[PDB]
Structures are given as C-alpha cells and as structure tokens.
Design a binder for this molecule. Structure first.
Ligand SMILES: OC[C@@H]1[C@@H](O)[C@H](O)[C@H](O)c2[nH]c(CNc3ccccc3)c[n+]21
Ligand SMILES: [Br-]
Ligand SMILES: [Br-]
Ligand SMILES: [Br-]
Ligand SMILES: [Br-]
Ligand SMILES: [Br-]
Length: 837
C-alpha cells in the first residue's frame, strides 16, 4: 500500500503464572485460559460441572513475554509505532526497560511511538496482567455498596468497575471465565515521514444523481522538518477508478488535519439484504512525498442513507429505519459473543455466522451491550451481506459508576470505537445501554439502597447515557442515530407504554404468557423477545453424560442461567405437545416448540406493519454449549427456530392466522415491487392425503410493495367440524397470473397435542458423495415437524424441521466437508407421533 513495513508480533510468546518463574509457550492473540487448556492445566471448561474448577484462574496475575529482532536499517526509519489492538484488561507493558503503557480498557486500541526505545538486535517485550478481580477488590471495598449486577456471578459485583466485556463475569446463558490476555493483534510499523491516524469518509449528501463526500484525514508527522506532500484520494469500483482528487500541503510536525471533497455522479447505492446489492466502493487515501507513497489507508464504502425515525404520532412514538428513503421493516436477531474466549473465534466462524443470517433473510443484527464492540471483520461481513448493525455501547442491566476517572475511560472507548466503525455502510445506530433505565425504574432499587445512593445512581445515569455518550456520537458520528437505552420507554408489564418506542417483550418466557399473546401484545418495534430450548443431542453429548439426561439434573441446571429455568420449558411444552417420556424425544420436541412459538410472534410483527416496524429476536447465537434462547447452538447447528425464522422472514409470506374459531389469510411483502393479478389457492387435506371439499380460489389479488394486507376471512363453523380440525391441514399457495408459484404455506387448525396423528414410517433413499448427501423422503401419511438428525457437527441442511406432507416426496441436501463417499452418513428421522404411544 505504501513504503512502511509491518511486523506482526504473533510468535515466540510465552506466559507465566506470576510468581512461579515457570514459563510456557503461548499463542497471541489469545487468552490466559486457552494457554492453560493447551497445556492441560485446566479441564475442558465447557464439559460437565467443570465451571467451578476453572474459577481460580481469575485470582492469579499473568505475565507474557516475547522477543524480536530489529535491524540497523529498520532502526533508521523515521518512525516506529507499536500498536495493541486489544489488551484485556489491566496490563503494564514494558519494552527494553521502559514502561510504555498502563492499559485499563479492553475496548481501546493503543498506538505507541517506540523508535527511541528500540535497540539494534534483540528487543524484549513484557506484559504484566493484573487480575481484574484483585485489581478491583480495593475499589469495591471503598465503594460502600454492591452494584446490583445480578449477571456478575460472584458475591462482589466487580464487573461494573472495569471496562471489560460484561458477559465475561457470567450471564444468564453464559459461563464465568474472567480471562486476560492480548486479545487482538500486536503490530510494529516502521515508516517514513507520517502515518494516517484516521481516515473518515464523511457523506455530505446523496441523491440518485450525486453523492458528495468529504475525505477527512488526520496525519501524524513524526520528523522535525516541514514536509511538502500531496494528498490523494482514489475512488474505485471493482478495480476501476471512478474519481480521483488531490491536494498539496506542507505537513507540519505532529497532527495535521486534511479535508478533500470528492463526488460520485450517478452513485450505485448500497442496499440491504432483500432489496438489492450491497455495493461497496473502494476509497484509498495516500500521502505522497516526492516519489514515495509514505502512507496509505483504504475503506470500503457503501453509499446509502439510513434514517431512524423516532417521532410522536397517533399511536405513541414510532421507531423505524428508512433506508435509501424507503421504510424498511427490520428482520433479525440479537447477537452475543460467539465464545467465552474471544480470540478462539476464527475467520471461518464469523463468515459462517453471516451466511446463517443472510440465508435466514435477515437485514439487521443488534450487537447487544453485554458483549464487545465487534472486530473489524464482523462489520466488513455485515457490509458485504447487506445487514444493518444496531451497536449498543458495552453497558448492560446494571447502573454503572460515573466518577470522573471512570467517565474518562468510557470517553476513550467511545471515541476509539466510533472512529473505528464509522466508515461501515452497515452501521445504522448506537444505543447507550441494555435495560439500565428499565432497571432503575422497575427492578426494585429504591428499596435495596439508601435514598442517597439511589439518587447518586440516577444522576450517574444521566452523566453517562444522556450527556457523555450522546455528545461523543454527536461529535464523531453526527449523522447516526443514538438512543440512551433499549427499551427506552416501553416496559413489558405495562400495556399503556407499548405504543412508545421499542419493546423488550419478555411477557413470553419471564411472564409465562402463551405465544398467542404475541398476536395481541404489539410493539412499535420488537428489539427483544425469546424462548429457550435445549440444543440437539450431538451438542448435549459435547457437555453431558446420559446419567448424564433429565430436565433438572445437576448438569442440566448447571447449564441453565435464567432466573427457572428448565421447569418453564416443560410448562410451555405441556400446553401444546404431549410431553415425551424420553430425554432425547423431549429435546427434539423442545426444539420444535421454540421454533413454532417464536415464528408465531415473528409473523405477528410482520402482519402488523406499519404499527410494528421491526422484530429482532433474542437470541441469534451461543458462546458455549448451553440451554438458551439461541436459534443456532455453539457448534453452528441450526435449531428449528433458525429454519422457522428463515420462513417467517421470507420476502413474500402467506400468513394464515386463526383466532376466535375464524381464519384470516394475510399476504405480507417486503419486496420493493408491487405484485399484480395474483391468485391465492387453498385446500383442506386430511392426514392420508385425501382432499376434503373443493379447492378455494381467491383471484385478482394485488400485493403492494412493503405491506401486509388481509385477502381472505372465513368462519370455521359450517366449514370444518371439530373432527376435521383434528385430522386435516390447510395447504395455501400464491401464484402469479400464469400459475407460477411465488409462495406457499401450511396451516394446522388445532394444537399439535390435539391432532390425531397417524403412526407412520418416513422412508428415505440416499445418494452420498464427498461433501454431500442427497436424501429423498417419503411418507404415505403426514409426519409432523420432522427432524433429520445426523451425528456430524455443523452439517448443513437445505431444510429441516418441516412437515412431511402425505404422499409428497421431499428432497433434502446435507453438506459437510467431513462427508466421505463410502462411509455412509448416520441419519435418524424423528417426528411428533413417534414420541408417544
Ligand atoms: O434473559 C435472557 C435475556 C438476557 O440474556 C439479555 O441480557 C437480554 O437483554 C434480556 N432482557 C431480558 C428481560 N429482562 C430481565 C430478565 C430477567 C432478569 C432481569 C431482567 C431478558 N434477556
Ligand atoms: Br517513533
Ligand atoms: Br505514534
Ligand atoms: Br492542521
Ligand atoms: Br440522549
Ligand atoms: Br381458534
């Protein structure tokens, strides 16, 4: 890119428990815990009851060291800069006898001038990590009260004192592994003249005819002389220059601010998943001094507008996203860290997770505030997949300190990550925290703390979430939306508040409300709602024994962290399904349950646009093997919920909704084009495959762009008897003028437990080659909610958790790199009727 040389300090690292004098090889970026595991100095933290057996680690201090060589030629470069993209958390960094840095915030990258401290030959780097617990014990003792952070799984709630990933201290789906280490890369850059400290491509305006941009560079010049330079910006698309601009300057020692306007005529816009291509331009800034390009930085840039509209209206206060001027109904999920040990998350795992969102027709992900500001790769993948990103700051569920030192650390991370992320097309909004305002209003505090301490907490809220964070966003990301808290007003126990802003409706699960309540309890935007399930058996076998297999054994409860657990799964299951006697069948039906109940809500929210303008379910993914609200387990396996979210988020959806012994059929489209001259066709089919009555035809339908509309209503009485309702289903297709199918749905008229399901044999043929299995499935009679189960971790399915309709063949492709020709894939097909006698 330029004349600099970058040395990655990713080898030759060793670590030691402080005070032992024993050193072992370590992997950096990494964690103390992984380094221990890799020498069998911890048990598999995820296996069994082993969580208690790993806790001692957080009490020790840990040292890391490496050495490296610098040449006489490198040492004579104008500048040499050591960069820590991440240190978790309290780290004293020494290089060749110099204390370079006393680090104290996991979420901040540190850039350090080191030329004057480096030596020709061997150079020695030592990092001392103070235990974040022992570091903060004296701070807690001075505080005189315990912050109410119930997800911090320790008697003393020390999490609140440290700018360290909240979930690391435990959460209601997570293991406590309070880890330390060099968690993101370390980089030594040898360079001449200057580095580009920041490059911000600021969009000033965008219309169909012109995008106007301001390229804002901050250049740190490291030599004593004034240096003539030319700044150049090249804008390209797919390798071809679109526009190019330049500016002469003379760079002064220290910081220089440079602004170059650029325009792209007839811009090709970045569109979200579902509405087109997520086009990205390549913007490259260079600093040229004489012949040499001494510094260069590039960003991929998406040209689009995002506006969050949050305005008083007749229904209360709206909360929705307008993308490229068009209201966009949000479809997605809440994202949590993908591992207890962040650096174990590989490039491949990030890529697969985005394939999983894109394939489920999502257009939004919330990076929830108990995790981390995600790495650059996460955002690059969001940009290239058309997925909008809601980014919480990293504060969740408790009030936090607001003393001057604490607020300076926070300001440092807010500036760092805002500048880090603000060039991403995907980045859509910032949210000050998760549930802290709700917590302060509703969760009991005025009777847990003195009135003085409670008042302090309330003024402390404002200092951080209503002043410091919104001011920082206004300064560094001024055209992006900020809201101080999610949910900002609406509270799930208070119906009167549901028309105001975004909701976390935990009436389902925590309030024990039936899934049917999601049809009536409607929000303006659902930013959280959820339901737990045990993960499938091959994941259970990664973490439990057949002994170790009851819903409330020590081990199952050890793998449940919500305030209840596993009893609640059984309670809800009983409402809708016959509860199976075996543990394996109970796991299967609980997957089915979570998928069917949650998709009922996803459909209610889309059906009720424009009152409701988004749904993000809790939660996408898992950080370890566990029972949780996730749609995808720790090993990448889609639960039923993920297949059902795909179906519910389909661009065009036929949604039959039955209430009060009556059926309505809604046609729901997130297409940018209107469909004309459409025909809905339906027919009742019993479980043996025989049609009941005649086909019903609704012709001449239009499905306008971005709308949900009722096209058919019929009372059940006079049409089907209670007996038929238990013994048949409705098949629904939507087709264009010429008979081409654009959508299909199936409807059942009774709860699954009330269906008279025939005993049946799902048979299959298989064609297996390397990487691939093609199965053809057949059953003469209905097989309900079939699960095609294979022991192969992370195998992918074209479909799963679907009703196999009577006498109707169904092709399913299974893929995995570990599918070998001639070593046939174990396949177990389960279905509802098989689970009881
Ligand atoms: O409990 C599941 C999820 C959480 O993991 C996550 O923090 C997410 O923001 C969230 N919000 C709630 C609702 N609020 C509470 C539930 C239980 C105890 C305290 C608060 C539930 N959940
Ligand atoms: Br330097
Ligand atoms: Br520097
Ligand atoms: Br300047
Ligand atoms: Br605010
Ligand atoms: Br009904």
């Amino acid at each position: 890119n330029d004349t600099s040389e970058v040395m990655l300090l990713d080898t030759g690292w060793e670590f030691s428990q402080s005070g032992t004098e024993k050193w072992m090889p370590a992997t950096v970026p990494g964690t103390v815990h992984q380094d221990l595991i890799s020498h069998e100095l911890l048990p598999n933290p995820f296996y069994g009851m082993n969580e208690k057996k790993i806790q001692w680690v957080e009490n020790e201090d840990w040292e890391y060291r490496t050495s490296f060589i610098v040449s006489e030629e490198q040492l004579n470069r104008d500048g040499i800069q050591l960069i820590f993209e991440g240190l978790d958390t309290y780290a004293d960094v020494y290089l060749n006898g110099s204390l370079l840095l006393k680090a104290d915030n996991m979420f901040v990258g540190y850039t350090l001038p080191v030329k004057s401290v480096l030596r020709k030959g061997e150079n020695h780097l030592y990092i001392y990590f103070h235990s974040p617990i022992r570091q903060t014990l004296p701070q807690y003792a001075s505080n005189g009260f315990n912050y109410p952070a119930d997800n911090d799984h320790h008697e003393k709630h020390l999490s609140v004192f440290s700018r360290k990933a909240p979930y690391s201290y435990g959460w209601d789906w997570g293991i406590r592994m309070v880890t330390s280490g060099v968690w993101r890369p370390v980089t030594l850059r040898f360079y001449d003249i200057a580095t580009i400290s920041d490059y911000y491509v600021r969009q000033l305006s965008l219309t169909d005819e012109n995008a106007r941009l301001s390229n804002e560079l901050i250049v740190n010049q490291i030599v004593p002389q004034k240096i003539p330079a030319e700044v150049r910006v090249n804008v390209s698309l797919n390798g071809t220059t679109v526009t190019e601009v330049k500016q002469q300057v003379t760079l002064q020692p220290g910081i220089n601010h440079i602004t170059l306007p650029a325009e792209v005529t007839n811009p090709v816009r970045w569109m979200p998943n579902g509405w087109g291509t997520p086009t990205l331009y390549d913007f490259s800034a260079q600093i040229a001094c004489g012949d040499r390009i001494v510094a260069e930085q590039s960003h991929r840039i998406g040209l689009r507008t995002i506006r969050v509209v949050n305005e008083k209206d007749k229904d209360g206060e709206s909360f929705y996203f307008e993308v490229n001027g068009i209201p966009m109904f949000a479809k997605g999920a809440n994202y949590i860290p993908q591992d207890a040990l962040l650096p174990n998350v590989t490039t491949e795992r990030y890529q697969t997770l985005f394939r999983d969102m894109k394939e489920a027709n999502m257009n939004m992900v919330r990076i929830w505030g108990g995790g981390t500001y995600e790495n650059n790769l996460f955002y690059d993948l969001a940009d290239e997949n058309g997925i909008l990103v809601w980014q919480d700051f990293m504060f969740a569920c408790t009030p936090y300190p607001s003393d001057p030192t604490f607020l300076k650390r926070v300001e440092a991370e807010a500036v760092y990550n805002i500048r880090r992320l603000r060039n991403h097309a995907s980045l859509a909004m910032w949210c000050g925290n998760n549930e802290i305002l709700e917590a302060l209003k509703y969760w009991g505090f005025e009777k847990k703390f003195t009135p003085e301490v409670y008042q302090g907490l309330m003024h402390g809220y404002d200092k951080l979430f209503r002043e410091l964070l919104p001011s920082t966003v206004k300064e560094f990301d001024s055209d992006r939306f900020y809201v101080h808290s999610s949910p900002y007003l609406a509270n799930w126990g208070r119906p009167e508040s549901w028309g105001t802003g975004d909701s976390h409706n935990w009436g389902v699960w925590y309030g024990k409300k039936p899934f049917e309540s999601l049809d009536t309890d409607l929000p303006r935007f659902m930013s959280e709602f959820g339901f737990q399930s045990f993960p499938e058996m091959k994941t259970i076998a990664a973490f439990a024994a057949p002994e170790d297999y009851q819903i409330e054994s020590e081990v199952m409860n050890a793998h449940q962290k919500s305030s209840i657990g596993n009893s609640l799964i059984r309670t809800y299951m009983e409402r809708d399904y016959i509860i199976p006697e075996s543990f394996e069948d109970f796991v299967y039906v609980g997957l089915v349950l979570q998928g069917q109940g949650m998709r009922h809500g996803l459909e209610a929210h889309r059906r009720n646009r424009p009152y409701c303008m988004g749904t993000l379910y809790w939660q996408l993914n898992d950080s370890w093997p566990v029972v949780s609200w996730s749609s995808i387990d720790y090993y990448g396996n889609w639960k039923a919920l993920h297949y059902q979210a795909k179906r519910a988020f389909a661009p065009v959806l036929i949604n039959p909704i039955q209430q009060n012994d009556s059926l309505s059929v809604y046609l729901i489209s997130d297409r940018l084009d209107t469909m004309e001259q459409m025909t809905l066709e339906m027919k009742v089919v019993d479980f043996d495959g025989k049609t009941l009555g005649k086909k019903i035809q609704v012709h001449s339908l239009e499905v306008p762009a971005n709308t949900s509309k009722c096209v058919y209503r019929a009372k059940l009485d006079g049409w089907l008897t209670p007996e038929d309702c238990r013994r048949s289903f409705l098949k629904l297709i939507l087709k264009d003028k010429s008979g081409h199918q654009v959508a299909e749905s199936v409807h059942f008229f009774r709860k699954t437990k009330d269906l008279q399901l025939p005993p049946t044999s799902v048979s299959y043929q298989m064609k297996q080659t390397d990487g691939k299995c093609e199965l053809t499935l057949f059953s003469s009679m209905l097989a309900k909610d079939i699960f095609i189960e294979t022991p192969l971790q992370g195998a992918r399915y074209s479909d799963n958790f679907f009703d196999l309709l009577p006498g109707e063949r169904k092709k399913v492709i299974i893929t995995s790199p570990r599918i070998k020709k001639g070593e046939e894939l174990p396949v177990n097909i389960k279905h509802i009727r098989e689970t009881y006698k």
